[PDB]
RNA sequence: AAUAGGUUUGGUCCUAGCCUUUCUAUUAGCUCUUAGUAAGAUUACACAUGCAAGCAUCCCCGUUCCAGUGAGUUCACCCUCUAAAUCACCACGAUCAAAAGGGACAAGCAUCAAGCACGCAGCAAUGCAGCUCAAAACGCUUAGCCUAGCCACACCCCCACGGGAAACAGCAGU
């Protein structure tokens, strides 16, 4: 359970596909602005390992920490595509939906 | 067999409370202290009465009677004697054991001697390293003049007995031979001027009845609370003084003739009060306003 | 004035009344909520109000917000674990929405007393050292001790000046 | 008040000045009863109601309307232009 | 910038800069009685002289500390892992704390806007062509710092085999 590496846990968007087995993730975090106490979106680039290369520039996945990193930039994994790009499910009721419409009604299976 | 009441049993603390009293004009007095600019919010007429309520809860709570209790035994124990370091230094040490989580009272503050003796510090010596090294806010590590006794006179010419008491509070345990001294002297001052209502809607004035009663001088507070239209407070202390003295005339007087109410005053006015002439007019006036009320 | 609408929010005093204080399994908290729709106000109320109190509470708490991604709102929970939590907010008012995380995923008081006590044991009374620190420098301050040279002048015995002086 | 003489001015400003007296109401005849912030043109005036003891820390010449209304204890903040009349 | 004040005009209002009043530090002028206490080269320029590391039945240990300086400057903080060291020797440990790995971490200039190999996969062979950057990369300049203290330096060549050369930025002193 234990790793070296900072950051264990992390959500964010595929902005790069182009490396072998490798997606270009940006995450963004909640930083205070301490003049102004307005939080703003502060963003940094993982790179996570994605051995199926099921990656799609713009989904959002989860990445995961490795025990340790296995290149100079790479410390993460790919651990769970959470959105699909363009294919989300939503998981309050399992159906797919297209923005804030369903696709299927949650009906059709009660 | 059969117990005498202590100070904290509910039964004692119940008749205390109540003959001690609330007042929020007098319990939550503006405080002379840095102000601020006030808050104001609009209330409706439940609203109102509920702040009003919290205010009450708060005040029972500033009215906790302090514990009473009997003075603190002198602490002389030896731990060792090494006569080896006799005449090995000039002045003697004082350890205190400074560990934050422990009581102070089962913290070990000991004190090597120039004769070599190793001794726990006494009481006062404790208390004074306490504050040294816990410092306490409102507790002086030197006794402050104001507690003696020509300094006391002082503040109780200005009716300021409650000051005392809160400086008392402040300077030493409720179990220090200073802390008992200063409030029986303090409440001596208010039985001789029949200043009782000094003490009233304050944590003091049940700490005050439990000296009178224990110490069978009741007559001053008792002529008080009639003076003031307080039977009820008055008929308790003379029931509070029967439970605390069951083997005595007034408590017998009471049960051969079933004495209840305003009859319990007069069995104790004849038989035990000093006063005995001084109650039953004061009380026989009380009836008679009372009967012209009624008619 | 203050620029923008309710700028109570950007505040010290709002940012500290929160009080949804994650445990450490918690590591991200993604908010997906709707722009519009009378049933996800709730939602767009909690990201307006209550999110930057929870970051302020939760500075290492990874916070993203995701727009009009799904028909309904919702917050899921990622923990260190692994595990997964869905609230579903729909229809819930901002209030109980920072009830609900706090009593799935937050503290409990007794909890954050415990911690505020073991913050009071760094700080202890009899130690002396720079006000930063300690509430006294030297003993000096401590009435009844030999007071400092630079506002009591020691006795010529107790100095070295004079000590040297006799002896030589 | 205008005229060509010093003393002429005086007369006729204190004089006229009686008959378009403000009242102006006092909490505990100490303060105002609340914080007061305006602006009149280009001059902004913020007041804060204050409790007893804090004193008139107020620009010199509001301290001085003060003492004629009666204001012991005011905090206020002068910005913007700074000119008497307004 | 504050409770503010002075100053643009023939005059008024507005805007605006400048200055005044407050509190410290250094230096200069003039002046100065005592006591206690704190603090105390301008200069990383060159240094006369003296001293500043010994201990101990020989081995070793120590002189790697303390003391100094502020030249350089995101090596200081947190996590992970794990040496040396302390707990007499072992503690499958505790404390303490390197190296390595992850994260975080000054100011000014965008008239420094591109950097020029700065990436990834694979046991390897090798393959792919990526990586950073206007949310400020790269670059230049300034500066010891976040002060129970910490970082850096220790005549210079970042280093110190070697070379230049012969060293007080230890105390006193010139
Ligand atoms: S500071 Fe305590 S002796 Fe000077
Ligand atoms: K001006
Ligand atoms: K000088
Ligand atoms: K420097
Ligand atoms: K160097
Ligand atoms: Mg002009
Ligand atoms: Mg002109
Ligand atoms: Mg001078
Ligand atoms: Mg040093
Ligand atoms: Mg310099
Ligand atoms: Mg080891
Ligand atoms: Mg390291
Ligand atoms: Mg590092
Ligand atoms: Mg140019
Ligand atoms: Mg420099
Ligand atoms: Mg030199
Ligand atoms: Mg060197
Ligand atoms: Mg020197």
């Given at each position: 359970v234990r790793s070296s590496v900072h950051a264990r846990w992390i959500v964010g968007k595929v902005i790069g596909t182009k490396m072998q087995k490798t997606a270009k993730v940006r995450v963004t975090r909640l930083v205070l602005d301490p003049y102004l106490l307005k939080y703003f979106n502060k963003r940094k680039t993982y790179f996570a390992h994605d051995a199926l290369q099921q990656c799609t520039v713009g989904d959002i996945v989860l990445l995961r920490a490795l025990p340790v990193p296995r290149a100079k930039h790479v410390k993460h994994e790919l651990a769970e595509i959470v959105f699909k790009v363009g294919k989300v499910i939503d998981p309050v009721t399992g159906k797919p939906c297209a923005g804030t419409t369903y696709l299927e009604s949650p009906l059709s299976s009660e | 067999e059969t117990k005498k009441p202590t100070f904290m049993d509910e039964e004692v603390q119940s008749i205390l409370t109540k003959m001690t009293g609330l007042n929020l004009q007098k319990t939550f007095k503006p405080a002379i202290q840095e102000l601020k600019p006030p808050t104001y919010k609009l209330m409706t007429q439940a609203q109102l009465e509920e702040a009003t309520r919290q205010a009450v809860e708060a005040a029972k709570v500033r009215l906790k009677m302090p514990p009473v209790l009997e003075e603190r035994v002198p602490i002389n124990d030896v731990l060792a004697e090494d006569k080896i370091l006799e005449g090995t230094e000039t002045t003697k040490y004082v350890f205190t054991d400074?560990?934050?989580?422990?009581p102070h009272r089962e913290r070990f503050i000991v004190v090597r001697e120039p004769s070599g003796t190793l001794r726990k510090a006494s009481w006062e010596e404790r208390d004074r390293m306490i504050q040294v090294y816990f410092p306490k806010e409102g507790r002086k590590i030197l006794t402050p003049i104001i507690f003696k006794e020509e300094n006391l006179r002082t503040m109780y010419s200005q009716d300021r007995h409650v000051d005392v008491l809160n400086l008392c509070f402040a300077q030493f345990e409720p179990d220090s031979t200073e802390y008992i001294k200063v409030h029986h002297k303090t409440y001596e001052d208010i039985d001789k001027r029949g200043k009782y209502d000094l003490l009233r809607s304050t944590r003091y004035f049940g700490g005050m009845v439990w000296y009178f009663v224990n110490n069978k001088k009741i007559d001053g507070l008792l002529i008080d609370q009639i003076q003031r239209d307080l039977i009820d407070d008055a008929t308790n202390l003379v029931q509070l003084y029967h439970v605390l003295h069951p083997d005595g005339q007034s408590a017998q007087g009471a049960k051969d003739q079933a004495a209840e109410g305003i009859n319990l005053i007069k069995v104790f006015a004849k038989t035990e009060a000093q006063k005995g002439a001084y109650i039953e007019l004061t009380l026989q006036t009380y009836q008679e306003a009372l009967s012209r009320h009624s008619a | 004035p203050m620029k923008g609408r309710f700028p109570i929010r950007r505040t010290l005093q709002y940012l500290s009344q929160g009080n949804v204080v994650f445990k450490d399994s918690v590591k991200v908290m993604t908010v997906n909520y709707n722009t519009h729709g009378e049933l996800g106000e709730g939602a767009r109320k909690f990201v307006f109000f209550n999110i930057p109190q929870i970051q302020y509470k939760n500075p290492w708490v990874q916070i993203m917000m995701f727009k009009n991604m799904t028909p309904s709102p919702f917050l899921r929970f990622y923990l260190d674990s692994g595990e997964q939590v869905l609230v579903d907010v729909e229809t819930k008012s901002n209030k109980e929405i920072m009830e609900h995380i706090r009593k799935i995923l937050g503290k409990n008081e007794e909890t954050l007393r415990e911690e505020e006590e073991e913050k009071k044991q760094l700080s202890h009374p009899a130690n002396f050292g720079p006000r930063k620190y300690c509430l006294r420098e030297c003993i000096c301050e401590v009435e009844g001790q030999v007071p400092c040279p630079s506002l009591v002048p020691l006795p010529k015995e107790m100095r070295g000046k004079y000590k040297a002086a006799l002896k030589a | 008040g205008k005229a060509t003489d010093r003393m002429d001015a005086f007369r006729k400003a204190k004089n006229r000045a009686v008959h378009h007296l403000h009242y102006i109401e006092r909490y505990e005849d100490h303060t105002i009863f609340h914080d007061i912030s305006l602006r009149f043109k280009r001059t902004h005036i913020k007041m804060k109601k204050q409790p007893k003891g804090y004193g008139l820390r107020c620009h010199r010449a509001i301290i001085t309307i003060c003492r004629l209304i009666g204001i012991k204890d005011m905090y206020a903040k002068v910005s913007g232009s700074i000119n008497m009349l307004s």
């Open positions: - | 400074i560990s934050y989580s422990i | - | -």
